[PDB]
From a paper:
The unc-51-like kinase protein kinase complex ([name]) and the class III phosphatidylinositol (PI) 3-kinase complex I ([name]-C1) are the most upstream and central players in the initiation of macroautophagy. [name] is the central scaffolding subunit of the [name] complex ([name]), which also contains the [name] (or ULK2) kinase itself, [name], and ATG101. [name]-C1 contains one copy each of the lipid kinase VPS34, the pseudokinase VPS15, and the regulatory subunits BECN1 and ATG14. The two complexes coassemble through extensive contacts between the [name] scaffold subunit of [name] and the VPS15 pseudokinase subunit of [name]-C1.
Three potential binding sites (#1(370-387), #2(392-398), #3(409-414)) on the opposite side of the [name]^MIT^ binding and one (#4(449-460)) on the same side of [name]^MIT^ were identified ([Fig fig2]), consistent with previous hydrogen-deuterium exchange-mass spectrometry (HDX-MS) and site-directed mutagenesis data. The supercomplex structure showed that the N-terminus of the BECN1 and ATG14L binds near [name] sites #1-3 on [name]. The interaction with site #2 is asymmetric and we therefore hypothesized that its main role is to inhibit 2:2:2 [name] formation. We hypothesized that [name]-C1 acts by displacing the [name] from site #2, and potentially, sites #1 and 3. To test this model, we truncated [name]^MR^ at residue 450 and determined the structure of the [name]^1′1–450^ [name] core by cryo-EM in the absence of [name]-C1. The 2D averages clearly show densities [name]^MIT^-[name]^MIM^ heterodimer on both sides of the shoulder ([Fig fig5]), which was confirmed by 3D reconstruction at 4.46 Å ([Fig figs2]). This demonstrated that [name]^MR^ has an inhibitory function on recruitment of the second [name] kinase to the [name] dimer, which is relieved upon formation of the supercomplex with [name]-C1.
Numbering used by the authors:
A (entry chain A): 1 to 81, 124 to 212, 304 to 387, 424 to 597
B (entry chain C), E (entry chain D): 840 to 1044
C (entry chain E), F (entry chain F): 462 to 476, 487 to 516
D (entry chain B): 160 to 209, 304 to 353, 461 to 595
The structure:
């Protein structure tokens, strides 16, 4: 069933396809181009009750695709540019216009609704960025000294030797290159340069003026919401009085008032035209605030994303700092691991030898006992239980003393210790 | 034939821009920041580049070598078009060819000097180089293009509001060149996505 | 659109060396010979 | 005819002829067994009871249906059935007269041969039982040795397990300290590699129970019984 | 008319035969050719039995108690025969019952032997008698009967079947008594086997 | 017949005692009482 809707910019009337009526409101977005209108790229719509037309949301979930509680449409493209039967027929037009006034009220209400969400959404991010930037403002000094420490560490790493035996993991060289080796398009210098580039791009000299501009825009949006919505403050009561008078006159009609009612019907259109005047007056305040807000909106989010990312890489920037002392300690750790592997191998060998000796001797004793009496006397049944083999100790060998550890040399450790920079204490 | 001439000229412009990228790789410039830059950052980046020049020079050599391969292909195609399709021996074509030849000689000289400089470097760092997976030149070109686009967008926002059209056109040309030299559909999808994005953003003008 | 493009461009749709180092002298000499030949071709002007 | 079938027991008769002295030897073996049964009566049986009876007493009672006297009388009856004085001479006379429809003589000879073979097997059992006092003194020695070995093995294995536990704990502590220090710094899993391997600790554990099914004959009680039975106390 | 007494009388005849079996358990005997070469082997068996006479006498006294069970069953309120009319005009049957009562008194004497044996058992083989799980007297009686049958077969082979027929008859009566005492299912199966054996013996008659 | 008997001899059929052993004096007293009762009873013949 094809949809029946409203369009305030088009006299509160609209039509759409059946998919627009039942399926996701993206079908309604497509059908906006239909029914002699521009597409949703040049339109904006909301369901009765102010429900914003979410394209993904099913029109069935919207429940406004028919003339009953029909959705209203705001056209952005519009912003981009004998004879007694009349007693009811004239009144017939008025009531629809009267309902249109109510329909008109909903659109402003829906417009206000979006502003409320817009105001909330904008304000929420505002403080979020405000805190973040202030956090960043405080963090500005913190990041700086960190970068200098990173540079000093890079120099030390240059002074620091290369991997020595670890190269064979698969000559004169430094861990700095080894550090620089990984992620060839993303070297350390690239990281530092990107960080400082964001920092400069995060200039408070611009951020603060941008923040002030955003605050002024938000205040202007609030004022427009106060002003444009108030633009039709006096309409409701006057329209109600006119509609009541029209109803009473039509009822009395059952031709002195006939022209009077006809003129009153004509007089209504001027109010309707006057109503249109308030609309575009209000509508201009809407989109202009809306568009500008959207332009500022994502920017802060993008700024936040930029703010977040700068925070993000800052940690990674911080991460590389410990690498020199970390590797210096790691060398000694691997050396201790090798020594422990040696000692453990010796202990395991001694234990295995003793266990093999004892197991062999006990097996010999058991063999002698069996030779004496294995099935050699009925006394075995009565004396059952002694035929057990002796204890099964651990005469076997260990599995592996962490073989996957890479190769290293203690003399290589001494050579590195002699050759290394002041990080020798971290490896002392 | 002038269409083939235009294709050659596009190759030429892509080569020139790639050479500019190579030069920037040789030495980085923070003037693109705009308003200002912390002095320490300049000092820190200076120390870092001084410490890591050798590998940076190596990346420069790889890039220049890719440029040279492009130039050699262009020269072979130039001999071909000379054999047929000279298009009245266009003086414009002659000047384009001469500029290409000068660039090629520059590329050869640069490659020779870089190889001579890296001799000891390539010698000492042989083991890691064997361990290291090579840094694809096309990857470097794409990275320069992407960083340029990002900086241009940041300037578009945050009220720099200048030079955006020039940097945008330049990066569009660079992306088109990379796509022409892409020859790998997997990342060619991403390349086409970026090119379409650049074209769409070009509607701002 | 362009303002919206930043989100898309914000993400990187990203794409043994000693072997290359070996071929360096060969490619260099090949380039030198090609340079001589290309200069000769240039002389045709 | 039936003599061909009876030839099986006829061949057995030569073995019986061989056994004739062997049974007489077994008779001597039987006398030694009786003396050993008396010595087993002097010997006790209380160790590993499962009280105060003798070794011969327990052995005879070890089977309620039959005992040493039962098998001894059975052996005497078998000797009578194969009597060298008459029956064995009678058996030989029948074997000779076989050459003088032969189902009866053949069946009798085969049954007698089966009985004699059973008698020889029982004699072997008797001989094993006559060894059984020696085998009991030996089994007591083996049980005491097993107790000593179990004690020594328990001590050694426990010391080994304790030392291995101490070593494994110390290594685990050092490894935990090293791992905690820069647990995820400088791409430790990537820059270095394999440091995360916890040192092996299989040797730390202790063995399970072994030889638990021992009849729990006390070694001191074994020595007491050995001293109380000097007669053939050597085994 | 006389069952209440005649059944107990047959049971008491079986008890008397069991007493004879116990007497045989008291001392060994020789037959089927008499003593053999080196009959000291039989004397050796006698020496061993003397060394082990305690267990044999204990088995005999256990059988005596098992029979004394039914003996006391008859003795306690013994007017069942009169109530059945067995004793009606049968004072001689009552005198036979009194003879059976004197037999029960002999069983009491054997039970005194049993008390001495049990005292000696608590003295030596106390825990053994505790874990004895020994065969009931019925199994021992059946084993003695089977040994008698085997001796009868050996004698019949030895052409001395003159008295072996009486031995077969006595063993058949013992089998009948055991069947009267055949409480267990395995006892019933063994009684069937004994019936087949009695049929074979009657065939051998 | 004889062969069957020999086979039966060759393979005769087949079929904690402190539980019965301990009750020996009690059963002895019970039997003594029953014997005395029957001794009195036998005079009724």
């Amino acid at each position: 069933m094809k949809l029946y809707v409203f369009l305030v910019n088009t006299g509160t009337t609209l039509t759409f396809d059946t998919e627009l009526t039942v399926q996701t409101v993206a079908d309604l977005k497509h059908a906006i181009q239909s029914k002699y209108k521009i597409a949703i790229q040049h339109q904006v719509l909301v369901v009765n009750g102010g429900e914003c037309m979410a394209a993904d949301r099913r029109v069935c979930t919207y429940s406004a695709g028919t003339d009953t509680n029909p959705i209203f449409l705001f056209n952005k493209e519009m912003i981009l540019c004998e004879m007694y039967e009349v007693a009811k027929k004239l009144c017939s037009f008025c009531e629809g216009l009267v309902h249109d006034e109510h329909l008109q009220h909903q659109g402003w209400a829906a417009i206000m609704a979006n502003l409320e969400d817009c105001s909330n959404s904008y304000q929420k991010l505002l403080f979020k960025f405000e805190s973040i930037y202030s956090n960043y403002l405080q963090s500005i000094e913190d990041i700086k000294l960190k970068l200098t420490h990173l540079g000093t560490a890079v120099s030390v790493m240059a002074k620091i030797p290369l991997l020595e035996c670890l190269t064979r993991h698969s000559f004169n060289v430094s861990l700095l290159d080894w550090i620089n080796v990984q992620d060839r398009p993303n070297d350390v210098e690239s990281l530092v340069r990107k960080c400082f580039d964001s920092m400069s791009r995060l200039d408070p000299r611009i951020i603060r003026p941008f923040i002030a501009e955003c605050r002024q825009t938000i205040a202007k949006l609030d004022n427009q919401n106060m002003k444009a919505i108030k633009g039709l403050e006096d309409r409701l009561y006057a329209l109600d009085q006119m509609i009541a008078s029209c109803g009473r006159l039509v009822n009395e009609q059952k031709l002195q008032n006939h022209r009077k009612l006809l003129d009153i019907k004509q007089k209504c259109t001027t109010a309707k035209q006057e109503l249109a005047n308030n609309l575009h007056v209000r509508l201009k305040w809407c989109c202009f605030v809306m568009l500008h807000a959207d332009q500022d909106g994502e920017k802060l989010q993008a700024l936040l994303r930029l703010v977040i990312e700068l925070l993000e890489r800052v940690k990674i920037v911080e991460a590389l700092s410990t690498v020199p002392q970390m590797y210096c300690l790691a060398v000694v750790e691997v050396v201790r691991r090798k020594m422990f592997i040696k000692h453990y191998r010796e202990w395991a060998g001694a234990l295995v030898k003793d266990g093999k000796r004892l197991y062999e001797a006990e097996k010999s004793k058991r063999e002698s006992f069996g030779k004496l009496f294995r099935k050699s006397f009925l006394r075995n049944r009565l004396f059952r239980g002694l035929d057990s083999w002796p204890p099964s100790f651990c005469t076997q060998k260990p599995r592996k003393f962490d073989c996957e550890l890479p190769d290293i040399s203690l003399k290589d450790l001494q050579f590195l210790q002699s050759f290394c920079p002041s990080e020798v204490q971290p490896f002392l | 034939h002038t269409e083939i001439l235009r294709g050659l000229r596009f190759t030429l412009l892509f080569v020139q821009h790639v050479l500019e990228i190579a030069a920037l790789k040789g030495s980085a410039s923070e003037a693109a920041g705009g308003p200002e830059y912390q002095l320490q950052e300049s000092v820190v980046a200076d120390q870092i580049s001084l410490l890591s020049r050798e590998w940076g020079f190596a990346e420069q050599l790889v890039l220049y070598l890719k440029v040279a391969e492009l130039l050699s292909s262009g020269l072979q195609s130039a001999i071909d078009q000379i054999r047929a399709g000279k298009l009245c021996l266009s003086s414009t074509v002659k000047q384009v060819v001469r500029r290409l030849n000068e660039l090629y000689k520059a590329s050869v000289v640069s490659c020779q000097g870089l190889s001579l400089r890296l001799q000891r470097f390539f010698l000492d760092k042989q083991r890691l180089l064997d361990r290291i997976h090579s840094i694809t030149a096309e990857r470097l070109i794409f990275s320069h293009a992407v960083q340029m686009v990002q900086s241009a967008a940041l300037d578009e926002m945050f009220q720099h509001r200048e030079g955006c059209v020039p940097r945008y056109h330049k990066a569009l040309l660079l992306l088109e060149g990379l796509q022409h030299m892409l020859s790998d559909q997997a990342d060619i999808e991403n390349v086409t996505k970026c090119k379409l994005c650049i074209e769409r953003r070009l509607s701002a003008l | 659109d362009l303002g919206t493009f930043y989100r898309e461009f914000q993400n990187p749709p990203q794409l043994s060396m000693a072997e290359d180092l070996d071929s360096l002298p060969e490619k260099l000499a090949v380039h030198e010979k090609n340079v001589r030949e290309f200069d000769a071709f240039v002389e045709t002007l």
